[PDB]
Design an enzyme around this catalytic site. Structure first.
Site, PDB file in Angstrom:
ATOM      1  N   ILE A  21     -79.134 -80.987 -14.149  1.00  0.00           N
ATOM      2  CA  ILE A  21     -80.524 -80.968 -14.585  1.00  0.00           C
ATOM      3  C   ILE A  21     -81.101 -82.379 -14.478  1.00  0.00           C
ATOM      4  O   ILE A  21     -82.202 -82.552 -13.938  1.00  0.00           O
ATOM      5  CB  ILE A  21     -80.683 -80.371 -16.006  1.00  0.00           C
ATOM      6  CG1 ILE A  21     -80.262 -78.890 -15.993  1.00  0.00           C
ATOM      7  CG2 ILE A  21     -82.155 -80.522 -16.496  1.00  0.00           C
ATOM      8  CD1 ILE A  21     -80.309 -78.157 -17.268  1.00  0.00           C
ATOM      9  N   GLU A  23     -80.746 -86.807 -16.160  1.00  0.00           N
ATOM     10  CA  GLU A  23     -80.188 -87.759 -17.106  1.00  0.00           C
ATOM     11  C   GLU A  23     -80.998 -87.661 -18.406  1.00  0.00           C
ATOM     12  O   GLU A  23     -82.207 -87.374 -18.396  1.00  0.00           O
ATOM     13  CB  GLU A  23     -80.255 -89.194 -16.534  1.00  0.00           C
ATOM     14  CG  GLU A  23     -78.960 -89.998 -16.598  1.00  0.00           C
ATOM     15  CD  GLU A  23     -77.836 -89.536 -15.684  1.00  0.00           C
ATOM     16  OE1 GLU A  23     -76.770 -90.194 -15.689  1.00  0.00           O
ATOM     17  OE2 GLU A  23     -78.013 -88.523 -14.967  1.00  0.00           O
ATOM     18  N   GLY A  24     -80.306 -87.899 -19.511  1.00  0.00           N
ATOM     19  CA  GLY A  24     -80.916 -88.067 -20.820  1.00  0.00           C
ATOM     20  C   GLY A  24     -80.557 -89.410 -21.425  1.00  0.00           C
ATOM     21  O   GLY A  24     -79.873 -90.223 -20.803  1.00  0.00           O
ATOM     22  N   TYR A  26     -78.315 -90.064 -23.254  1.00  0.00           N
ATOM     23  CA  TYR A  26     -76.858 -90.164 -23.386  1.00  0.00           C
ATOM     24  C   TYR A  26     -76.098 -90.280 -22.038  1.00  0.00           C
ATOM     25  O   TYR A  26     -75.057 -90.932 -21.985  1.00  0.00           O
ATOM     26  CB  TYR A  26     -76.350 -88.976 -24.228  1.00  0.00           C
ATOM     27  CG  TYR A  26     -76.781 -89.107 -25.678  1.00  0.00           C
ATOM     28  CD1 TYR A  26     -76.064 -89.900 -26.566  1.00  0.00           C
ATOM     29  CD2 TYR A  26     -77.975 -88.553 -26.122  1.00  0.00           C
ATOM     30  CE1 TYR A  26     -76.489 -90.089 -27.877  1.00  0.00           C
ATOM     31  CE2 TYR A  26     -78.412 -88.728 -27.434  1.00  0.00           C
ATOM     32  CZ  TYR A  26     -77.668 -89.503 -28.311  1.00  0.00           C
ATOM     33  OH  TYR A  26     -78.076 -89.692 -29.612  1.00  0.00           O
ATOM     34  N   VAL A  29     -76.760 -84.484 -17.948  1.00  0.00           N
ATOM     35  CA  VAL A  29     -77.030 -83.212 -18.585  1.00  0.00           C
ATOM     36  C   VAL A  29     -77.041 -82.121 -17.526  1.00  0.00           C
ATOM     37  O   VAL A  29     -77.753 -82.236 -16.527  1.00  0.00           O
ATOM     38  CB  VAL A  29     -78.321 -83.207 -19.453  1.00  0.00           C
ATOM     39  CG1 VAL A  29     -79.535 -83.689 -18.677  1.00  0.00           C
ATOM     40  CG2 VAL A  29     -78.579 -81.824 -20.039  1.00  0.00           C
ATOM     41  N   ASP A 134     -87.922 -91.278 -33.795  1.00  0.00           N
ATOM     42  CA  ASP A 134     -88.263 -91.333 -32.376  1.00  0.00           C
ATOM     43  C   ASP A 134     -88.879 -90.041 -31.888  1.00  0.00           C
ATOM     44  O   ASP A 134     -88.573 -89.499 -30.818  1.00  0.00           O
ATOM     45  CB  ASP A 134     -87.026 -91.680 -31.535  1.00  0.00           C
ATOM     46  CG  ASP A 134     -87.333 -92.219 -30.147  1.00  0.00           C
ATOM     47  OD1 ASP A 134     -88.445 -92.678 -29.936  1.00  0.00           O
ATOM     48  OD2 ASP A 134     -86.407 -92.187 -29.267  1.00  0.00           O
TER      49      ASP A 134
HETATM   50  C1  LIG Z   1     -83.545 -84.254 -27.186  1.00  0.00           C
HETATM   51  C2  LIG Z   1     -83.687 -84.294 -25.689  1.00  0.00           C
HETATM   52  C3  LIG Z   1     -82.997 -83.151 -24.970  1.00  0.00           C
HETATM   53  O1  LIG Z   1     -81.962 -82.630 -25.394  1.00  0.00           O
HETATM   54  N1  LIG Z   1     -83.593 -82.754 -23.832  1.00  0.00           N
HETATM   55  C4  LIG Z   1     -83.061 -81.782 -22.950  1.00  0.00           C
HETATM   56  C5  LIG Z   1     -83.125 -81.962 -21.576  1.00  0.00           C
HETATM   57  N2  LIG Z   1     -82.628 -81.056 -20.734  1.00  0.00           N
HETATM   58  C6  LIG Z   1     -82.065 -79.962 -21.281  1.00  0.00           C
HETATM   59  C7  LIG Z   1     -81.508 -78.946 -20.344  1.00  0.00           C
HETATM   60  N3  LIG Z   1     -81.959 -79.707 -22.599  1.00  0.00           N
HETATM   61  C8  LIG Z   1     -82.461 -80.625 -23.427  1.00  0.00           C
END
Ligand SMILES: *CCC(=O)Nc1cnc(C)nc1
Length: 341
Positions: A21, A23-24, A26, A29, A134
């Site tokens: 999907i 990057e976040g 962390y 993802v 945040d």
């Molecule tokens: C809090 C941010 C977060 O979890 N965003 C997120 C991004 N992409 C997916 C698939 N789920 C959550």
């Protein structure tokens, strides 16, 4: 073990058919098929750990609320010695408010419902004596039916109003465009009013699809805020005892208030009355989450018996900032034990 974009994404046989999907905050993802519950889920990889990871896990595992993302499962090695990556499995949500606002005009009905759900979740968080710290569109997840869940508790803290005061221009961690004016003046962001300001900024952003105060660096953020609210009143200045902060404000030319109905000519009048009360300069005069829920804008949804609170205030057992790296890894291992076979 499975790999994604040339990197190990090792979620065991329970989770298959990965799709990258992005990057976040962390790391990587992916979504994956959950072979037990028979639904696709979101999984984030966390790869010397960060105290923010422990904070997020401890809070999210303690909280249980419809408008707060849960943790469904946590994947890690069976021993500390073998533990490297930690995978956090959560409900898969279609989108988030950041993505939605980049592409979609919101109806007044969607703005009203999103704001309701934000404040309903926030009521629970503040009832646990926790500050999110945040709040912003990318931390508000939405499913295909527009149910909203708040995520990312990595910068959250237990509220501590008696220790909120600081000097002028004190550095701050949370996302710049959503920072209350007092962060730049005399506040560590240890009071609930910090989160209400962020919600106000989000509301304004839903009304126009553009961030209301897009500062390009620390002090520019304050000058965006003052460019719309106008110069603070004598009374609101007198509340700022710190001389460097006070005198900075006194040095500025007079700025007129920009009326909300001129910035947001298509907005509902009750939405703008509530926006005004959330974007109040003086944090002591700023509306609180329960008052916000009770505001006429939200009358179609307000029902305090269906706006639950936390069973108890939340507390960190040790002060996280002085833990060595080995003790932090050990604590993450312990906090995630309940998900082991
Ligand atoms: C809090 C941010 C977060 O979890 N965003 C997120 C991004 N992409 C997916 C698939 N789920 C959550």
């Amino acid at each position: 073990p499975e790999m994604v974009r040339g990197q190990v994404f090792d979620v065991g046989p329970r989770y298959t058919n990965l799709s990258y999907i992005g990057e976040g905050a962390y790391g990587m993802v992916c979504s994956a098929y959950d072979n037990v519950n028979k639904v696709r889920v979101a999984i984030k990889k966390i790869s010397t750990y960060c105290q923010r990871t422990l904070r997020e896990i401890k809070i999210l595992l303690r909280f249980r609320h419809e408008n707060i993302i849960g943790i469904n499962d946590i994947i890690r090695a069976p021993t500390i010695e073998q533990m490297k990556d930690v995978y956090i499995v959560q409900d898969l949500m279609e989108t988030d408010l950041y993505k939605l606002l980049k592409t979609q005009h919101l109806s007044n009905d969607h703005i009203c419902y999103f704001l309701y759900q934000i404040l309903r979740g926030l009521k629970y968080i503040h009832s646990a004596n926790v500050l999110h710290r945040d709040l912003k569109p990318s931390n508000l997840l939405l499913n295909t039916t527009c149910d909203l869940k708040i995520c990312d508790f990595g910068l959250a803290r237990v509220a501590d109003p008696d220790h909120d005061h600081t000097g002028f221009l004190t550095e701050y961690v949370a996302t710049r465009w959503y920072r209350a004016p007092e962060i730049m003046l005399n506040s560590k962001g240890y009071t609930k009013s910090i989160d209400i300001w962020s919600v106000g900024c989000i509301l304004a952003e839903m009304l126009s699809n553009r961030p209301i105060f897009p500062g390009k660096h620390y002090l520019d953020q304050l000058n965006h805020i003052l460019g719309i609210l106008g110069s603070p009143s004598q009374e609101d200045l007198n509340c700022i005892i710190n001389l460097k902060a006070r005198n900075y404000l006194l040095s500025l030319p007079h700025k007129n208030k920009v009326p909300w109905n001129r910035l947001f000519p298509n907005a509902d009048s009750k939405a703008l009355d509530l926006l005004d009360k959330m974007l109040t300069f003086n944090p002591h005069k700023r509306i609180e989450v329960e008052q916000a829920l009770a505001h006429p804008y939200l009358e179609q949804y307000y029902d305090p018996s269906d706006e639950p609170i936390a069973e108890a205030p939340f507390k960190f057992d040790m002060e996280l900032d002085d833990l060595p790296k080995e003790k932090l890894k050990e604590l993450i291992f312990e906090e995630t034990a309940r998900f082991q076979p």
